[PDB]
């Protein structure tokens, strides 16, 4: 009956609103986030996106994912690697681990990309559609809050230097999702997997929240 | 010999097994960090999962695509699990207990496969029992040490195969029977995919049990 993009928008309303209501997000938007906590979040992002982009690369020619493959426009790994150099140093990859909640999310991404790639759209939609929407605001907030350089270092993740217009690209992306040949069953499963994706993001946030509480006991 | 189902399953589920080996709950279990109540939840998930699995194997016991793999006496865990449930919860353990959300999904899938695609039931037996026969002894000793359980086996009877004299040899018998099934290459590949699903159902139970850990 309805488009996948609408099924997704409507089917993830509840989960999207709970994501806005998380303590970590409220403290972020209002500008009260501290360096070492931003570093854990950036780390969470790096491992998340590394897996996601590895799995999209795997399925770049899969008819159930091919139209959503935008390496040059959307991919965040390169940017996040630059952000990890700035915060952690030169040999960061040798020493940093993926936080537990991020590791769970990563595990799920690898499963989906390797075994049920028709559901990978759910993880791409959840992640990239959000990035394009709020990217400009969060970049400005974090820079001012942490006294970061205006030239961009430390926030490369939030800048899409190959998207000329975010709104127009979102429109493009929705139309590509809707063109995918899918049963009503597979569509329902995709919506269910996006809600799972949000729940993984929730776990990540409240991990950071409780990591911030142990950050406050020390300081 | 790489066309043999047992090879196809081992090569085909390698990535999934690596994931299972390194997941947070499994690592925390092996270190001895899992406590009594969380072990009671873990066992609960096992009970419902194996009830479903052993019901569907009982149903398909005569099906040509599964029959040789029917081992109620050697493999079935339901009776062992029941005794473990009794030991931790007491006599009225049934009314004390409910299946965790992720276990329900696993159970629902087992029933579907057993009722609608019986040719893929081997994928579920493979994933569960072959794992059980490989690590049970270690898991048992870990559980006993962490929870101060008796050496006589109370609470860990799930991990002991009383009617299997040699796990290693029995696994080889099982592999040989899997390879003996009259199956085309298309069905074999569908078995490998379901086996990967099976692993992920376990991943979700592990992931939920870790959440309960907090
Ligand atoms: C930091 C708090 C957040 C705020 C204030 C926020 C705000 C917004 C806004 C204003 C939109 C525009 C709706 C539109 O596209 O017309 C949007 C879209 C979206 N957001 Fe968020 N967001 C937040 C966090 C998140 C998180 C954590 C996720 C999950 C990864 C997420 C996922 C999405 C998705 C998938 C869309 C596109 C929906 C669609 O148009 O189909 N957002 N967000
Ligand atoms: C630290 C955790 C684990 C370790 C160290 C471990 C170890 C092993 C090892 C060494 C084998 C090889 C036995 C052989 O080929 O003779 C094996 C077999 C197997 N394991 Fe695991 N295991 C773990 C967890 C799991 C889990 C969670 C599952 C899924 C529920 C699983 C499923 C299997 C299966 C299906 C086999 C048979 C492979 C085959 O021979 O085809 N294992 N395990």
From Swiss-Prot, chain B:
Q: Which UniProt keywords apply?
A: Acetylation, Endoplasmic reticulum, Heme, Iron, Membrane, Metal-binding, Microsome, Oxidoreductase, Phosphoprotein, Repeat, S-nitrosylation, Transmembrane, Transmembrane helix
Q: What is its main location?
A: membrane
| Positions in the Cytoplasmic compartment | 1-214
The record places the site described as Important for catalytic activity at 132
Q: How does it sit in the membrane?
A: Single-pass type IV membrane protein
- Which species is the source of this protein? Homo sapiens
Q: What family name appears in the similarity comment? A: Belongs to the heme oxygenase family.
| Protein name in UniProt | Heme oxygenase 2
Gene Ontology cellular component annotations, sorted alphabetically:
endoplasmic reticulum membrane; membrane; plasma membrane; specific granule membrane
Q: How is its activity regulated?
A: Inhibited by metalloporphyrins such as Sn- and Zn-protoporphyrins.
